[PDB]
Design a binder for this molecule. Structure first.
Ligand SMILES: C/C(=C\C(=O)Nc1ccccc1C(=O)O)c1ccc2ccccc2c1
Length: 596
């Protein structure tokens, strides 16, 4: 069954003092040096690879080549994404067994099993714990990216935020005679922080909550006549509006924490009797206040709106926010464009003054991030035609919609992808399946919607750009699969790749063709399967070229075997777009190296 070792620190073990009957005594030395390293207080920054090379004696590996093989694993762990694994067989395949001293008294055929077992011990008891001792792993939530923050820096940060919450209303010290139902976690968020709770969970039953919130999502679409579909709204809006569109996007600051608890309670109380009535309402009422959380041995009451992390917060915040909408957003206009999420409001009208009446109004209702506001109003400092909202870029002038990406500088794009599924494991000798599973559609589905492929409001040149961009993402996933195929499946002949790559271009071109047909509108000119296939090949070429030495032969095969030229039907097309990496994709990091 089991093929994978998970790279996550979460699975580390607490090391014994010495080892048992099973393990060779050499592991005791490393355990010792591990404890010694932890006790040594040094002024100058910690390089894990360098420490580990003092902790695990060289006699454990016998040769530099063996040592270098183990530490490539350590190096992945030092650079892991969430959910990433390697194969368990990486830990024994291709080691120089004749050169490992502690293994000479064992006949050759039992060696790999022992090496695997001891390697696992080291990684579980020494490598992962050393990292945990010096670093806090932080999920940036930008894909599966993990950042490793020096533990003293994090604790300092964690304390500095803890006192701010203390010396505000947000966190009040409790007498311990309340008993918490989750632990307060402080997460660094770019410039600020996020104070969420991790539940045990259990709490009576988890299905009780799921069919409790299910009772609420009813109420949301009952006494609030809201419907809303971003695509339908934008489409119906743009088609009736002939003149220049004006619009604004307003970022709502901490919607969860700006919930006025008393107001939400009265909202819950009355009147959903046919829907919830009393036994439920009473449990929700006291749930919103008081919210009590475990921390540093101490128990605290959270007095700043809903707690992010509580299962009910999301649906109750939506419930609350819909009420604020009926309350303060009543005189907007039946003919204006409006759409919202918990974090977002997006409003458009051909009447510029209404876009002010909206900006001013929304500032009166909510606390909003005013630097994160985007508008094309000429009175603003820096007016802007293109408005990002819900993973999309809306151009208020051209009405075109593009997918938003989405990439900090220095971001390693391999973090966007999930190649390893611990629940559905692929043996080390089926790389083709791994490849094919990686090229499956579901992951890229939100780049392949009516927003990207319609020709109602979007021009055909826009559909092509959207498509080319989605295929650049797919190509980067392909590239990241290639890296995994080399370092974990240990592939050396990449021949089988050609036909998998070819099928993939065929399949994505075909899904595009269908989507374009289904959502065809008056702006359609003529899209062939051939044209789409070429855009796709071009997208792969623009990524593969980033490793011309590795991908030389593949690039040449594409240029000699595939059709890369296409006929365009709009003279307004930017033909250059299809020649090169677009700048938003041009400087993502594709090289993996340890930095702690
Ligand atoms: C996809 C691929 C090669 C590949 O992935 N290589 C590597 C990946 C990671 C690390 C090292 C290497 C390496 O080869 O040195 C490839 C190249 C040329 C091809 C030509 C024709 C058909 C298929 C082809 C496949």
């Amino acid at each position: 069954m089991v093929h994978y070792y998970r790279l996550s620190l979460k699975s580390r073990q607490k090391a014994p003092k010495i080892v048992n009957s099973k393990y060779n005594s050499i592991l005791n030395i490393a355990l010792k040096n591990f404890r010694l390293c932890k006790k040594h207080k040094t002024k100058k920054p910690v390089q894990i690879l360098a420490l580990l090379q003092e902790i695990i004696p060289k006699s454990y590996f016998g040769t530099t080549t063996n040592l270098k093989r183990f530490y490539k694993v350590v190096e992945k762990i030092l650079t892991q994404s969430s959910f990433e694994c390697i194969h368990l067989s990486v830990l024994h395949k291709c080691y120089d067994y004749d050169a490992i001293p502690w293994l000479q008294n064992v006949e050759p055929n039992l060696r790999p099993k022992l090496l695997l077992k001891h390697n696992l011990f080291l990684l579980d008891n020494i490598v992962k714990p050393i990292i945990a001792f010096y670093y806090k792993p932080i999920k940036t939530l930008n894909g599966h990216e993990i950042k490793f923050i020096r533990k003293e820096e994090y604790i300092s940060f964690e304390s500095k935020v803890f006192h701010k919450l203390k010396k505000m209303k947000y966190l009040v010290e409790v007498q311990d005679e309340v008993k918490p139902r989750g632990v307060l976690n402080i997460i660094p968020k770019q410039d600020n922080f996020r104070a969420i709770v991790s539940i045990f969970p259990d709490s009576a039953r988890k299905p009780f909550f799921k069919l409790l919130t299910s009772k609420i999502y009813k109420v949301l679409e009952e006494k609030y006549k809201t419907s809303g579909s971003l695509y339908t709204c934008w489409s119906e809006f743009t088609q009736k509006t002939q003149g220049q569109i004006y619009g604004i996007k307003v970022d709502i600051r901490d919607a969860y924490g700006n919930v006025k608890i008393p107001v939400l309670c009265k909202l819950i109380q009355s009147i959903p009797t046919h829907l919830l009535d009393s036994e439920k309402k009473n449990f929700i009422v006291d749930h919103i206040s008081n919210q009590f959380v475990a921390f540093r041995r101490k128990i605290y009451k959270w007095n700043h709106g809903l707690l992010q992390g509580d299962p009910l917060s999301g649906c109750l915040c939506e419930l609350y926010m819909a009420f604020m909408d009926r309350l303060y957003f009543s005189n907007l206009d039946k003919d204006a464009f409006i759409h919202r999420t918990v974090d977002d409001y997006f409003f458009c009208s051909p009447h510029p003054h209404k876009v002010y009446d909206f900006e001013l109004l929304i500032k009166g209702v909510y606390q909003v991030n005013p630097t994160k506001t985007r508008t094309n109003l000429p009175t603003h400092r820096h007016p802007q035609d293109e408005i990002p909202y819900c993973g999309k870029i809306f151009n208020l002038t051209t009405r075109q919609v593009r997918t938003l990406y989405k990439l900090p500088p220095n971001y390693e794009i391999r973090h966007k992808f999930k190649l390893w599924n611990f629940n559905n494991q692929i043996s080390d000798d089926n790389p083709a399946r791994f490849l094919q599973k990686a090229m499956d559609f579901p992951f890229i589905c939100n780049s392949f919607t009516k927003f990207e492929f319609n020709t109602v409001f979007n021009d055909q040149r826009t559909v092509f750009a959207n498509f080319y961009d989605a295929m650049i993402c797919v190509a980067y996933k392909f590239d990241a699969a290639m890296m995994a195929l080399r370092t974990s499946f240990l592939v050396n002949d990449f021949g089988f790749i050609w036909l998998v790559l070819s099928s993939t271009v065929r399949a994505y071109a075909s899904r595009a063709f269908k989507k374009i047909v289904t959502y065809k509108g008056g702006k359609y000119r003529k899209v062939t399967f051939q044209c789409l296939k070429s855009i796709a090949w071009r997208a792969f070429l623009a990524v593969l070229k980033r490793r011309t030495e590795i991908y030389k032969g593949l690039i040449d095969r594409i240029k000699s075997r595939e059709k890369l030229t296409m006929k365009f039907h709009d003279g307004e097309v930017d033909a250059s777009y299809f020649c090169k990496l677009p700048e938003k994709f041009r400087f993502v990091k594709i090289n993996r190296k340890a930095s702690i």
